[PDB]
């Protein structure tokens, strides 16, 4: 309390203090700039139909109003004003005041990641081969962009990840967007199909629109199965809307007019329901699989997972890994944390072999009926 006593009074000093000069000094950062830019201006945005020559007079449709063929700002050349360019229009005077850039809607920007998911290549044990190629599709071309010219070639401009549910594909997205640097666009096909007809087409564009103005960006599509994979067809025209959306993605994803530095990452569990047009190379080159860890792998998965907790140092995860034939690296995680309960269920700090053994037999086995890793292996 004496220290605590000193704490209170000390704080009260400033409290007492702050009030003092407060009385003394009794807007301009802005009220200037506000009033400064109050004599400034507004300008209704405009959509240019097109300009004309032997003189200028640019021709334009604003928006809620209509078309006005109108003069342009003196401060903008007759070039830096290409068609299809949302420009700003002296409101009253109705004359090009200044130019601008393009729309992208509030659905494409809402998915530009901003932050970054902490998932370094340390958590990605048991994939010395998976990440190995991935780094080629995404890492190396985006960073060291010399070699591929020193020898002149091109990298798997897009790459496919598949495997049952629980191999670590979303970590590789998270892994990449972590130690990547480029622009990682997280777009889920769940996002792609909406309500009104021909709406997804706008998304891919925006996607490819926004992918473009920003050289070297990773578009990633997890659950592409949602967007569109098969091209049925019959007397119902069901999965039609989505199909086009795929064709849209297809078209813009590698068909006439290059794409650019838009690298591509697709994540699926069923890499079997996917249109040849996606799969083909150009569009989707490097095809990478995510095995269900064997022996040495799981040991890395166990060691990685348990490496971050108070475990018994005698017990060797190798034994446990042995009792784990074909369980994804996710389940192996329910064990490592599973013991947590057991270890906590008594009152103990450190877990024992059996604690894991039970967990192994408690998770794996018990939660076997579910698993779904054997039904999703054949991609059903």
């Amino acid at each position: 309390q004496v220290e605590d006593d000193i704490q209170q009074l000390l704080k009260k000093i400033n409290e007492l203090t702050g009030i003092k000069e407060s009385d003394t000094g009794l807007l301009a950062a802005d009220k200037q700039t506000l009033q400064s830019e109050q004599p400034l201006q507004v300008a209704r945005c405009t959509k240019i139909i097109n300009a004309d020559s032997e003189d200028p007079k640019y021709i334009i449709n604003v928006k809620q109003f209509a078309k006005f063929v109108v003069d342009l700002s003196d401060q903008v050349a007759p070039t830096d004003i290409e068609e299809g360019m949302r420009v700003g229009v002296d409101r009253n005077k109705y004359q090009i005041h200044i130019p601008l850039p393009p729309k992208i809607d509030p659905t494409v920007t809402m998915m530009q990641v901003e932050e970054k998911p902490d998932v370094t290549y340390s958590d990605v044990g048991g994939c010395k081969e998976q990440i190995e190629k991935l780094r080629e599709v995404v890492e190396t071309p985006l960073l060291h962009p010399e070699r591929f010219v020193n020898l002149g070639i091109e990298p798997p401009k897009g790459v496919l990840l598949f495997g049952p549910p629980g191999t670590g594909k979303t970590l590789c997205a998270r892994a990449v967007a972590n130690r990547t640097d480029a622009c990682f666009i997280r777009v889920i096909g769940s996002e792609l199909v909406q309500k009104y007809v021909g709406e997804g087409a706008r998304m891919v564009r925006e996607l490819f629109e926004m992918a473009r103005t920003k050289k070297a960006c990773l578009i990633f599509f997890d659950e592409i199965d949602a967007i569109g994979g098969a091209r049925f067809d019959d007397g119902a025209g069901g999965d039609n809307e989505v199909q086009r959306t795929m064709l849209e993605l297809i078209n813009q994803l590698d068909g006439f007019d290059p794409r650019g530095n838009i690298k591509v990452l697709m994540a699926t569990n069923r890499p079997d329901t996917l249109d040849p047009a996606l799969m083909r190379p150009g569009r989707l080159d490097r095809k990478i699989e995510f095995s269900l860890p064997d022996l040495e792998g799981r040991t890395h998965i166990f060691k990685i997972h348990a490496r971050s907790m108070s475990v018994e140092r005698d017990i060797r995860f190798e034994l446990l890994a042995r009792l784990c034939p074909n369980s994804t690296g996710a389940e192996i995680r329910s064990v490592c944390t599973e013991a947590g309960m057991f270890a906590i269920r008594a009152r103990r700090k450190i877990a024992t072999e059996k604690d894991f053994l039970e967990a192994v037999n408690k998770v794996i086995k018990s939660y076997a009926k579910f698993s779904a890793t054997p039904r999703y292996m054949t991609y059903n």
Binding site: N14, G18, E21, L26
Partner: protein, 246 residues
């Protein structure tokens, strides 16, 4: 006393919050959050100083946000901002790169030369970038001593007026005031020492990098092994379980 005061003193001096980066801790709660916003203030006295002021913050709560923005504002209203934006990134980066300043080291690594002065400043900065082989940490209290050091505290605002006075007037009448920070400048440091206690083998839990021998590098570690008084992040000296003693 920094925000509440200055905040009311500024709106009622552009170096005001520069010192503030200073006593940090607050460099993370506000310095790291509001720091950049300070920097964004159009007054160059801020745009000069905040990049400097970020430094101890940068080794006490550095950020990645503005780290890129400095690149943006490099030539925004000024090339000295650029001259800073190169230099400043060296500063904050020269002892707080990667991890928290990942977006910082990158730029400077992508900073080379558009100008022999840029090149000069970049060579400075990338020197600063790799200053201490790129591993250093600025903290009023080296390791986990649990005691404030007024030695380095004196090494700082010294560097504020030195680079703040000559900055407000011409480029740089000199350049020998670069090192005044060294009075405390520490590495990225975990000092991990043995039960006898002049340098000898001894080890910890894992770092990044291994079991750390006497004074081997990392920063802010909470390890398996025990220190002597108040086990902590940072400098920890190592005694081991009599049965398992080592």
């Amino acid at each position: 006393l920094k925000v509440q005061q200055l905040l009311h003193i500024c709106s009622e001096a552009v170096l005001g919050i520069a010192l503030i980066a200073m006593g940090e801790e607050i460099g993370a709660e506000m310095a790291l959050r509001t720091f950049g916003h300070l920097l964004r203030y159009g007054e160059p006295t801020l745009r000069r100083a905040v990049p400097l002021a970020l430094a101890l913050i940068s080794v006490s709560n550095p950020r990645l946000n503005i780290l890129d923005t400095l690149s943006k504002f490099s030539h925004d209203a000024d090339p000295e901002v650029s001259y800073n934006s190169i230099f400043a990134m060296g500063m904050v980066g020269s002892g707080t790169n990667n991890a928290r300043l990942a977006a910082m080291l990158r730029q400077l690594a992508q900073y080379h030369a558009k100008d022999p002065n840029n090149l000069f400043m970049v060579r400075l900065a990338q020197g600063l970038t790799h200053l201490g082989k790129g591993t250093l940490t600025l903290c009023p209290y080296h390791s986990d001593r649990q005691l404030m050091s007024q030695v380095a505290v004196a090494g700082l605002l010294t560097v504020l007026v030195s680079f703040l006075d000559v900055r407000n007037i011409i480029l740089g009448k000199s350049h020998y005031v670069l090192y005044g920070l060294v009075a405390a400048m520490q590495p990225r440091m975990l000092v991990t020492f043995d039960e006898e206690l002049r340098p000898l083998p001894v080890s910890v839990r894992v770092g990044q990098p291994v079991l750390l021998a006497h004074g081997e590098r990392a920063e802010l570690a909470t390890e398996e092994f025990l220190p002597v008084t108040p086990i902590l992040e940072g400098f920890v000296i190592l005694r081991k379980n009599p049965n398992y003693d080592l």
